[PDB]
CSV table of C-alpha atoms in Angstrom, one decimal:
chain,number,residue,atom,x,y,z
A,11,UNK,CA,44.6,135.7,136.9
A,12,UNK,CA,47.0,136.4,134.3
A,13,UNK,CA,46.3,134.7,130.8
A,14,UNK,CA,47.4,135.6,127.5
A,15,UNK,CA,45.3,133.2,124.4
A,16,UNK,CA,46.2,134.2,120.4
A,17,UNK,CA,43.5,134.1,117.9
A,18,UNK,CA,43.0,134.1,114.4
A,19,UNK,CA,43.6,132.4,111.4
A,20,UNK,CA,46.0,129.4,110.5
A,21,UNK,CA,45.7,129.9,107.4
A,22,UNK,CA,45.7,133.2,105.2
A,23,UNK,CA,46.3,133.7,101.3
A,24,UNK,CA,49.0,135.7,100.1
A,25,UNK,CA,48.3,139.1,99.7
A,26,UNK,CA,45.4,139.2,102.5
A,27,UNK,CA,45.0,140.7,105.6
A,28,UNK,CA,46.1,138.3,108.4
A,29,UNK,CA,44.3,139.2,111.6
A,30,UNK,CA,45.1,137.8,114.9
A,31,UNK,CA,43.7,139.0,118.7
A,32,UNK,CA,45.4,138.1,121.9
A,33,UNK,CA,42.8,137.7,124.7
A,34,UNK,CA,43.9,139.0,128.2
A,35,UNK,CA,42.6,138.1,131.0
A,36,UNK,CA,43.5,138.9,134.7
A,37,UNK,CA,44.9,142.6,134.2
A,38,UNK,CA,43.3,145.3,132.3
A,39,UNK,CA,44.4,146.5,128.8
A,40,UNK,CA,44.4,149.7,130.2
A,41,UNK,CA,47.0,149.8,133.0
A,42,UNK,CA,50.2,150.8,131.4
A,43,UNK,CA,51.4,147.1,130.8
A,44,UNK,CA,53.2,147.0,127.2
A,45,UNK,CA,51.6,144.6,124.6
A,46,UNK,CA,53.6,143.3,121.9
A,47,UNK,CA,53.4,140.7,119.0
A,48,UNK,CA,56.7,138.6,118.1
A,49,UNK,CA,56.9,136.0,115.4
A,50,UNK,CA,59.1,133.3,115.1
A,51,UNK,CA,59.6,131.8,111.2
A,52,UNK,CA,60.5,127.9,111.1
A,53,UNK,CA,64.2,127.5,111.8
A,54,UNK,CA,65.1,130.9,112.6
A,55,UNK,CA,64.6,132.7,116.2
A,56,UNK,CA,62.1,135.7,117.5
A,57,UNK,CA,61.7,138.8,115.7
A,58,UNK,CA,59.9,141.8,117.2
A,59,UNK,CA,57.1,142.9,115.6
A,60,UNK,CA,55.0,146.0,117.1
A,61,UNK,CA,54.6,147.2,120.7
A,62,UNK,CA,51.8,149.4,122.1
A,63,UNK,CA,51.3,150.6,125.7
A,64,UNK,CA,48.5,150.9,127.5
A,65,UNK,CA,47.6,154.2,129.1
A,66,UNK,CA,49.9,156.1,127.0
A,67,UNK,CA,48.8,154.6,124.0
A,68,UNK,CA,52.5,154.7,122.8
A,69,UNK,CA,53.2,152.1,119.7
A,70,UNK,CA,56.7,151.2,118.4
A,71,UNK,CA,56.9,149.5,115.1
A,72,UNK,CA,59.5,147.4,113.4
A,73,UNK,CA,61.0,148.6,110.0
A,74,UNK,CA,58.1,147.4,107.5
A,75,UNK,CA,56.7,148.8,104.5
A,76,UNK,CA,54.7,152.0,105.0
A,77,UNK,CA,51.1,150.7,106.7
A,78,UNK,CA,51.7,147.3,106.9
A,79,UNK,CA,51.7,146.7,110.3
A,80,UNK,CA,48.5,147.9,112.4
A,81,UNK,CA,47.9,146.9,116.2
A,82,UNK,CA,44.7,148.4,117.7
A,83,UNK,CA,43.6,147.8,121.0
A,84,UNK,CA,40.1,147.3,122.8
A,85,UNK,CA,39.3,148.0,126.1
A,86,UNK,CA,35.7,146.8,126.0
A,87,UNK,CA,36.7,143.3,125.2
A,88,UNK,CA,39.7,144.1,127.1
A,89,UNK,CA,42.6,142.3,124.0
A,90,UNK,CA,44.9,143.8,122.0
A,91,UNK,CA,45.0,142.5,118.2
A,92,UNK,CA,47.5,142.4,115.0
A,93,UNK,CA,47.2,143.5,111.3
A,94,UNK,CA,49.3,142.9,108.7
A,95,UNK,CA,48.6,143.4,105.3
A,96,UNK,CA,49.7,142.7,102.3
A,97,UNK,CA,51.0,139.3,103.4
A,98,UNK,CA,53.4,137.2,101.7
A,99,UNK,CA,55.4,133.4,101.8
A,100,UNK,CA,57.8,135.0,104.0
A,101,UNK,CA,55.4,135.7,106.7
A,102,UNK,CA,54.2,132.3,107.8
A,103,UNK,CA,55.7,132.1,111.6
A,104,UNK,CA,54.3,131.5,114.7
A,105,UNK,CA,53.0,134.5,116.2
A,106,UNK,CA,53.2,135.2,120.1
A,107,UNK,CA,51.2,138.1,122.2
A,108,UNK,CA,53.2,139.0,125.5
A,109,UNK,CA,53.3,141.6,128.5
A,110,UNK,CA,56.2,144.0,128.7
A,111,UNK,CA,56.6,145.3,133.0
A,112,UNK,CA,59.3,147.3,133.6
A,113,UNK,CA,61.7,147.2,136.4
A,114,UNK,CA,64.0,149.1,138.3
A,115,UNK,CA,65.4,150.6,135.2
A,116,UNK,CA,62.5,152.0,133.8
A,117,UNK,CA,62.7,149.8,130.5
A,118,UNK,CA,60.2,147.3,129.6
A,119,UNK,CA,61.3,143.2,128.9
A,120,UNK,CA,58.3,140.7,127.9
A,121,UNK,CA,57.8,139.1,131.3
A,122,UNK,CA,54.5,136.7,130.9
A,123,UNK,CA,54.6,135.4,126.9
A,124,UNK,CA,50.9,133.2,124.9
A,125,UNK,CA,51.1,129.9,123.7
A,126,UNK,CA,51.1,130.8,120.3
A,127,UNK,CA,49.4,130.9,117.3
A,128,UNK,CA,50.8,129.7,114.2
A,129,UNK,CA,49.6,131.1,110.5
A,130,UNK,CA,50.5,129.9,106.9
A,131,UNK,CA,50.7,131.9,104.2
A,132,UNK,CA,50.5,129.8,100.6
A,133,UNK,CA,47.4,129.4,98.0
A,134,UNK,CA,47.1,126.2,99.2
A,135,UNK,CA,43.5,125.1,100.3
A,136,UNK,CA,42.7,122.9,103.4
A,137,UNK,CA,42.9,119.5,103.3
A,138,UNK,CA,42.1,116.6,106.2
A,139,UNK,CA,44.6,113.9,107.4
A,140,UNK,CA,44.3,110.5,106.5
A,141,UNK,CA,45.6,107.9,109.7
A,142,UNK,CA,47.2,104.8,109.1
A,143,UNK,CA,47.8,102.3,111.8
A,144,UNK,CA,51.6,101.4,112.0
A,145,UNK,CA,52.3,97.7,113.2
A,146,UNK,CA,55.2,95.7,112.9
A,147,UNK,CA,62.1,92.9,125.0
A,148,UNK,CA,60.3,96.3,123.7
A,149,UNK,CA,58.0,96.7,120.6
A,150,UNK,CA,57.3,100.1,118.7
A,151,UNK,CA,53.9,101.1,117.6
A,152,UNK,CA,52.4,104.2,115.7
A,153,UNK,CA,50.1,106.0,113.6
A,154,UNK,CA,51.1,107.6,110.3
A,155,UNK,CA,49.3,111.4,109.9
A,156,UNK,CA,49.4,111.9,106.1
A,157,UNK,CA,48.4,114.4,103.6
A,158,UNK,CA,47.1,117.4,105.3
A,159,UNK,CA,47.4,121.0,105.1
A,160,UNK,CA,47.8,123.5,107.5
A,161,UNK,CA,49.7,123.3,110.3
A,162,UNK,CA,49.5,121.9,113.1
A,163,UNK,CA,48.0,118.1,114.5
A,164,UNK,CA,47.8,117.0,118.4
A,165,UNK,CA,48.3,113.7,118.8
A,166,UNK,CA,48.0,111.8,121.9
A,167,UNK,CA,47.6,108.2,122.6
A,168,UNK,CA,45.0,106.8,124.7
A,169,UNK,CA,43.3,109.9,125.7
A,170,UNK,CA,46.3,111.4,127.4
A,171,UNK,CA,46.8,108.1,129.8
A,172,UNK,CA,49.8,107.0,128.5
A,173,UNK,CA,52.8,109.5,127.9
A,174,UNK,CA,55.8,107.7,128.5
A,175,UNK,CA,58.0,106.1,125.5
A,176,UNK,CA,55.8,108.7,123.2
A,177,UNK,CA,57.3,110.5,120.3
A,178,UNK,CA,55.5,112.6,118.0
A,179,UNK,CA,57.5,113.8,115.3
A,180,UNK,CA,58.3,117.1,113.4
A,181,UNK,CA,55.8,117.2,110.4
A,182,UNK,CA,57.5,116.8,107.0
A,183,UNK,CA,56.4,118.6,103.9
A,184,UNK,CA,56.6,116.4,100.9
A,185,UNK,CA,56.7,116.4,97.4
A,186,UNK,CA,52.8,117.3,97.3
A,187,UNK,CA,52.5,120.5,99.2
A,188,UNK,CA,51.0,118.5,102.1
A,189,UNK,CA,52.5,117.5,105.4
A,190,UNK,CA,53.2,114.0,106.6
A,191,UNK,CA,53.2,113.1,110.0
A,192,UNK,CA,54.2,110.1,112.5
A,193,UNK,CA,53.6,109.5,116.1
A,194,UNK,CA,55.1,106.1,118.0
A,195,UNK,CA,55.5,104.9,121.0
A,196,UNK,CA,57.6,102.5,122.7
A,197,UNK,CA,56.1,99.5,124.1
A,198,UNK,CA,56.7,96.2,126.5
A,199,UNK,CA,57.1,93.3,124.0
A,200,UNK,CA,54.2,91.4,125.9
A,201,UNK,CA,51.8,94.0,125.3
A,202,UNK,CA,50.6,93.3,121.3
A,203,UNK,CA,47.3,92.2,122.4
A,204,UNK,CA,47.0,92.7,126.2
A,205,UNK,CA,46.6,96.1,125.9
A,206,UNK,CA,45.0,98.0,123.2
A,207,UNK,CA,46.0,101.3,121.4
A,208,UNK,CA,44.3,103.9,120.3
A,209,UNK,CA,45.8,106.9,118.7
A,210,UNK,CA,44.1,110.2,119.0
A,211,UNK,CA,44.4,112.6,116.2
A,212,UNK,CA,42.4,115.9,115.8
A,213,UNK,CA,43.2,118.4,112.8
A,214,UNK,CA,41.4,121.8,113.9
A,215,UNK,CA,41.6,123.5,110.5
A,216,UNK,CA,39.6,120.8,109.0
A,217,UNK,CA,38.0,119.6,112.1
A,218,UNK,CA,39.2,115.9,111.9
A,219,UNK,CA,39.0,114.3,115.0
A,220,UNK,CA,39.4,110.5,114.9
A,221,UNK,CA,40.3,108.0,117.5
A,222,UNK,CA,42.3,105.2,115.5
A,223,UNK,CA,43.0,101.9,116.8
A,224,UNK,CA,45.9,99.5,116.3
A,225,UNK,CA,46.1,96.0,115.1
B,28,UNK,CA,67.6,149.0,114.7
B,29,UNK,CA,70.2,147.9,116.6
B,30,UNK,CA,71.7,144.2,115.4
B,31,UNK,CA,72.0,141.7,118.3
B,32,UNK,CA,74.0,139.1,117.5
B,33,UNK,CA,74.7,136.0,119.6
B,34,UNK,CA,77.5,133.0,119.5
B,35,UNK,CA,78.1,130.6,119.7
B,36,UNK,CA,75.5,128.9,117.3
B,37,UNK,CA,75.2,125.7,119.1
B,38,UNK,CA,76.5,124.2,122.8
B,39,UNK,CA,77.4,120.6,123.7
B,40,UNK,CA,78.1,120.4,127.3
B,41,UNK,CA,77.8,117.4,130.3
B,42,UNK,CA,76.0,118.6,133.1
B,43,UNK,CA,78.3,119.9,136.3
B,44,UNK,CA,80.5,122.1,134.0
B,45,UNK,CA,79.4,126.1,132.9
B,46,UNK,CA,78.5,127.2,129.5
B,47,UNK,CA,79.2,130.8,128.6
B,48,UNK,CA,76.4,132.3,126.1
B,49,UNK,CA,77.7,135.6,124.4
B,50,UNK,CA,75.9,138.7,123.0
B,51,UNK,CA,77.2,141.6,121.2
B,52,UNK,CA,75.0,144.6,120.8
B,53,UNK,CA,75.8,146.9,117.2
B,54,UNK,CA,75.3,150.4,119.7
B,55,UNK,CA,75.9,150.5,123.3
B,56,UNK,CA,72.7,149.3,125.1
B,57,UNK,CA,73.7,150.0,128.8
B,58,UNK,CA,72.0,147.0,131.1
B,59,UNK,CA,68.8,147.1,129.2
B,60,UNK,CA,68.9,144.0,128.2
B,61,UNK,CA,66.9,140.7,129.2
B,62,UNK,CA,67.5,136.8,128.8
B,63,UNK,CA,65.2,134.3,127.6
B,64,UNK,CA,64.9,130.4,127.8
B,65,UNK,CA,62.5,128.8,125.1
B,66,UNK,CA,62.2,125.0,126.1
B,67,UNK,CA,61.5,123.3,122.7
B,68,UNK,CA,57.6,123.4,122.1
B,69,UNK,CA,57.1,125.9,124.5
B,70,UNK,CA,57.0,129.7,124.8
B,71,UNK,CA,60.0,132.0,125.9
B,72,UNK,CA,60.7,132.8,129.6
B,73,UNK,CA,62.5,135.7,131.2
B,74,UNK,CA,65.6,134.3,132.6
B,75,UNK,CA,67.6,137.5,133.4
B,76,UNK,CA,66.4,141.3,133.1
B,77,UNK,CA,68.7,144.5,133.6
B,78,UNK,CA,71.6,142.6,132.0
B,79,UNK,CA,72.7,141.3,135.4
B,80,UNK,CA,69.2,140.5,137.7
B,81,UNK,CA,68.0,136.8,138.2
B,82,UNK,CA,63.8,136.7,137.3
B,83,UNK,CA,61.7,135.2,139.7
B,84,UNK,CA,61.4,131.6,139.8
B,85,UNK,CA,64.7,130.7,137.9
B,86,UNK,CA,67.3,128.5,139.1
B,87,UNK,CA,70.5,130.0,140.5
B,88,UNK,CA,72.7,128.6,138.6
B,89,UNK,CA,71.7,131.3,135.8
B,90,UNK,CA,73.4,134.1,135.6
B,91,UNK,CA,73.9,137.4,133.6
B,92,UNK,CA,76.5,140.0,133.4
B,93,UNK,CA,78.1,142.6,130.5
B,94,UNK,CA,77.2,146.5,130.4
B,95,UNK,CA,78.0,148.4,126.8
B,96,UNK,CA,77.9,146.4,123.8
B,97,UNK,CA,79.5,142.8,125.3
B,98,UNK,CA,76.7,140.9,127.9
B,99,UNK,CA,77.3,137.3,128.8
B,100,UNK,CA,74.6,134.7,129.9
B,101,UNK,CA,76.4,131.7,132.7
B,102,UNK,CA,74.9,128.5,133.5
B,103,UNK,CA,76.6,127.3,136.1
B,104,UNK,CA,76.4,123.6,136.0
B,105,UNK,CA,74.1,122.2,133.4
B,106,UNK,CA,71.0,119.9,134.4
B,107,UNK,CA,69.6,117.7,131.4
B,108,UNK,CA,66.3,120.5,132.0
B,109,UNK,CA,68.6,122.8,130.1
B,110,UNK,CA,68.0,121.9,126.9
B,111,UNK,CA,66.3,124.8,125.0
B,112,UNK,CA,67.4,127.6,122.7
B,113,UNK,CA,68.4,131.1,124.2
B,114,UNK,CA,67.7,134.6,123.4
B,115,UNK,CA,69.2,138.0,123.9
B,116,UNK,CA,67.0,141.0,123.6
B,117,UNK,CA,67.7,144.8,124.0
B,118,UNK,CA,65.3,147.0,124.9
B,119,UNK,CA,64.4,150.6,124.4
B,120,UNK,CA,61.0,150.8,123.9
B,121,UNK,CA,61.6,149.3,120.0
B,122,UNK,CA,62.9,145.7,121.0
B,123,UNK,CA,65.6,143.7,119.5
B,124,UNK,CA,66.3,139.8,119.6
B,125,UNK,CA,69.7,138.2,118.9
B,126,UNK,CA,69.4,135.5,116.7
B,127,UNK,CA,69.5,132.6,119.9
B,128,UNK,CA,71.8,129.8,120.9
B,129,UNK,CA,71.2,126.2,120.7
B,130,UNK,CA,71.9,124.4,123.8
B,131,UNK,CA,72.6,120.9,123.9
B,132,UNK,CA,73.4,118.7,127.2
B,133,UNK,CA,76.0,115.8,126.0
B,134,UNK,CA,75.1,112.5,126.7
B,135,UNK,CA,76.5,108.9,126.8
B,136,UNK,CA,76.3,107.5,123.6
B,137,UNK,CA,73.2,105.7,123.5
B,138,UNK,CA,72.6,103.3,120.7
B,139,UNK,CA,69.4,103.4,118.9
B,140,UNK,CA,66.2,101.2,119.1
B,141,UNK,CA,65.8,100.4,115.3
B,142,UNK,CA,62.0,99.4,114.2
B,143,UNK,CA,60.5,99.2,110.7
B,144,UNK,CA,57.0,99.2,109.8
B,145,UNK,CA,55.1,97.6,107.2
B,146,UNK,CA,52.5,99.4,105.4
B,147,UNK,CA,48.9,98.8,106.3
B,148,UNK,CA,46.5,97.0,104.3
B,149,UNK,CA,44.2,100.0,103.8
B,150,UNK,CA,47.1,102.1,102.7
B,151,UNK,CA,47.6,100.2,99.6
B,152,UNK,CA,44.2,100.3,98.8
B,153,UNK,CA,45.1,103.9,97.9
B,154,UNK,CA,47.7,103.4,95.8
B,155,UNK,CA,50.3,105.0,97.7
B,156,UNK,CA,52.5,103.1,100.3
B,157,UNK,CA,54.9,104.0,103.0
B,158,UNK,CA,57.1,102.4,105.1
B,159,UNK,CA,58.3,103.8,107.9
B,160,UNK,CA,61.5,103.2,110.0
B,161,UNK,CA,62.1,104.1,113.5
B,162,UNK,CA,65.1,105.3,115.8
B,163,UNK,CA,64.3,105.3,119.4
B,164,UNK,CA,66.1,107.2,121.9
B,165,UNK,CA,69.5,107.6,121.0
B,166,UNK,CA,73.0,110.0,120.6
B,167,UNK,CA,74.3,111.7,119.4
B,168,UNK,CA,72.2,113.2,116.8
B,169,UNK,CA,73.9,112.6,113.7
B,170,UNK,CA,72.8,109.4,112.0
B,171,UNK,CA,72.7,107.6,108.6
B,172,UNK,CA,69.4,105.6,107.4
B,173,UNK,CA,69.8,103.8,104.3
B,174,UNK,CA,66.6,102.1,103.0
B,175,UNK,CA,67.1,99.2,100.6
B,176,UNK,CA,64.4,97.7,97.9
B,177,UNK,CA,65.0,93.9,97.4
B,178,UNK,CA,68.9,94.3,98.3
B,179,UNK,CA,69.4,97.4,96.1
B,180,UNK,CA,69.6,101.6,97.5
B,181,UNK,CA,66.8,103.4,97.2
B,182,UNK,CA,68.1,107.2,97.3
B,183,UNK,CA,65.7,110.0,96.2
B,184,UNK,CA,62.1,109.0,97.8
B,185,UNK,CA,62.4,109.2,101.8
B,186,UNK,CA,62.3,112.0,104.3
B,187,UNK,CA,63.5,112.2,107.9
B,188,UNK,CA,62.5,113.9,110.9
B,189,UNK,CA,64.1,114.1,114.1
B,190,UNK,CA,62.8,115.5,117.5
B,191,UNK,CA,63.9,117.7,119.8
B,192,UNK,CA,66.3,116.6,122.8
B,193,UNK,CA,64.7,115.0,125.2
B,194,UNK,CA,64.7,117.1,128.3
B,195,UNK,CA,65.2,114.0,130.1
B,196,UNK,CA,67.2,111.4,128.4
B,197,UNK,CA,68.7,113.5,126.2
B,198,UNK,CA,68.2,111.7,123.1
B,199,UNK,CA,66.9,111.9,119.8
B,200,UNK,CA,64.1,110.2,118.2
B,201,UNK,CA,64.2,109.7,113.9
B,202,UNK,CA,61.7,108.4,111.8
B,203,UNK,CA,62.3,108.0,108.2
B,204,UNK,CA,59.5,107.1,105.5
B,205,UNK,CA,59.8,105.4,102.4
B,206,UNK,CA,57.2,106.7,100.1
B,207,UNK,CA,56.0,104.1,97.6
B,208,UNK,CA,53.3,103.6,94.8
B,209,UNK,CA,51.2,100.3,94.6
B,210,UNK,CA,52.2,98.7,91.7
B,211,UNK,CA,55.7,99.5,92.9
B,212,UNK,CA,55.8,98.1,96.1
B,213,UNK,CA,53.7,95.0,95.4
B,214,UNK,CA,56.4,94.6,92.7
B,215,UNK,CA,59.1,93.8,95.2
B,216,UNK,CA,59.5,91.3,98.0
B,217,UNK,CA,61.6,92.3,100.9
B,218,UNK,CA,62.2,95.5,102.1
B,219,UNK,CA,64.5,97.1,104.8
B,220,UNK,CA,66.2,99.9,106.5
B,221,UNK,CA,69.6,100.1,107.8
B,222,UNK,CA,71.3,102.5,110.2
B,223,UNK,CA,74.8,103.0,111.0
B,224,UNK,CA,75.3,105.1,114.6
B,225,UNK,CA,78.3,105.6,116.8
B,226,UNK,CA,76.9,103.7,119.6
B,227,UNK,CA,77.2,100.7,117.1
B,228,UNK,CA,79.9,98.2,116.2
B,229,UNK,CA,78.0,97.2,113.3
B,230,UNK,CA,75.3,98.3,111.2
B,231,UNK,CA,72.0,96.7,112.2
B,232,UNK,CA,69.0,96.1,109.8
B,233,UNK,CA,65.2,95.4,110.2
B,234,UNK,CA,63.4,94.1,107.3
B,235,UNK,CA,60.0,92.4,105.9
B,236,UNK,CA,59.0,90.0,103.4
B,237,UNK,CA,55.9,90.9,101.2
């Protein structure tokens, strides 16, 4: 009984609105917890965004342009949500909701932290993956994730079953304005045809979800 | 605002021996100021809180200490679990992160499992082809993949991407693709990739006809 889930959009075009709700579950938005929203741009490392308390009602805002920023929260639904404005490139990041408790100083640190939602910010439209089967002591085998657009792709390999020798790797961006992804795994050389493989790949954003088989 | 800045940038340390994470605060802060461990892939955790308290749950062999503008994080002997990027973050009721520290566990140098493959049948029907060449589980991280069209460089037309250490191993993971047109591919005969790592005496390549 203690849950924080993001919401919202992976994908927003510039100059919108980007919206995103954290739902809490297991402690009211009403006890004086602080909720906060902290983004974390590719490469670099977390930047505080906006804090607001329950019970008081206090907010604390990072220097942004005048009305940017907007966090509201919602007692009936019991979540606390995000508004920025006026979005631009720079503001694709991945965006975390966590709890701020205070201890024996009387100051507040983010003690419980969400998985995470990330959003993009670009005119770029959706587009779905295609999956290409990648085949040639210990063999190698894989499936190349190619041409889609957002951000991000699960892949896992025969249902979750196996996990070990697995390697999914960072997306690339390419030439295109698309992404490009592989995922291997490592494998006992008498194994191509024994055993069968079956990569899965699902693509929420344009709800893709395809169970590719190799060789 | 209050600038929190952090060094060093990046660790390399064997498990058994300390590494010393630093933090220097623009205004004096007091103790409020908190830790935070964020495994790659994976959310931040409060390691330390108060500048000098232990969270629950975490391993002894953290520490934190410093009062004013200097605060210090300790790991007292690394495990290969270690391996994530660290934050300092003041506190009043507007927060501040530092800019983090990339931790990295050394390793014994580990030479990598070179595989290449071939693109697939249905790929070319497309008219765009890509052949991809894989790096399994070695280190250190720094690596050179050359990829070679009928003997001769190709330099302008692949893209690399390495993973995150392994919080077990250690190691690093690259894949490399070769990006292709039909017509261009089905133009040339063999085709391979060859790496040159630290772990090896000599470069090894892999390679396919057709």
């Amino acid at each position: 009984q203690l849950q924080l889930q993001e919401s919202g959009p992976g994908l927003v075009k510039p100059s919108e609105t980007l919206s995103l709700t954290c739902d809490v579950s297991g402690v009211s938005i009403s006890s004086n917890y602080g909720w906060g929203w902290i983004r974390q741009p590719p490469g670099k490392g977390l930047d505080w965004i906006v804090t607001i308390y329950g019970g008081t009602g206090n907010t604390y805002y990072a220097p942004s342009l005048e009305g940017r920023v907007a966090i509201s929260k919602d007692a009936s639904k019991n979540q606390f949500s995000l508004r920025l404005n006026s979005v631009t490139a720079a503001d694709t990041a991945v965006y975390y909701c966590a709890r701020k408790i205070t201890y024996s100083s009387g100051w507040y640190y983010f003690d419980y932290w969400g998985q995470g939602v990330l959003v993009a910010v670009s005119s770029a439209s959706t587009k779905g993956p295609s999956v290409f089967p990648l085949a040639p002591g210990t063999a190698a085998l894989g499936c190349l994730v190619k041409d889609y657009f957002p951000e991000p792709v699960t892949v896992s390999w025969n249902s979750g079953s196996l996990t070990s020798g697995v390697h999914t790797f960072p997306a690339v961006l390419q030439s295109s304005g698309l992404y490009s992804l592989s995922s291997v795994v490592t494998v006992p050389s008498s194994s191509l045809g024994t055993q069968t493989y079956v990569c899965n790949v699902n693509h929420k954003p344009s709800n893709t979800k395809v169970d590719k088989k190799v060789e | 605002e209050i600038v929190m800045t952090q060094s060093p940038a990046t660790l390399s340390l064997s498990p058994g021996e300390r590494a010393t994470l630093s933090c220097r605060a623009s205004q004096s802060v007091s103790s409020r100021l908190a830790w935070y461990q964020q495994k790659p892939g994976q959310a931040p955790r409060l390691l330390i809180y108060d500048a000098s308290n232990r969270a629950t749950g975490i391993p002894d062999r953290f520490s934190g200490s410093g009062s004013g503008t200097e605060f210090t994080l300790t790991i007292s002997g690394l495990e290969p679990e270690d391996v994530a990027v660290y934050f300092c973050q003041e506190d009043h009721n507007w927060s501040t992160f530092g800019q983090g520290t990339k931790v990295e566990i050394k390793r014994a140098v580990a030479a990598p499992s070179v595989f290449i493959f071939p693109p697939s049948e249905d790929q070319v029907k497309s008219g765009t082809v890509s052949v991809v060449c894989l790096l399994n589980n070695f280190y250190p991280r720094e690596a050179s993949v050359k990829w070679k069209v009928d003997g001769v460089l190709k330099t302008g037309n692949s893209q690399e991407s390495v993973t995150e250490q392994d919080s077990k191993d250690n190691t690093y993971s690259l894949s490399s693709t070769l990006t292709l047109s039909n017509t261009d591919y089905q133009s040339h005969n063999v085709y391979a990739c060859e790496v040159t790592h630290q772990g090896l005496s000599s470069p090894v390549t892999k390679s396919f006809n057709r």
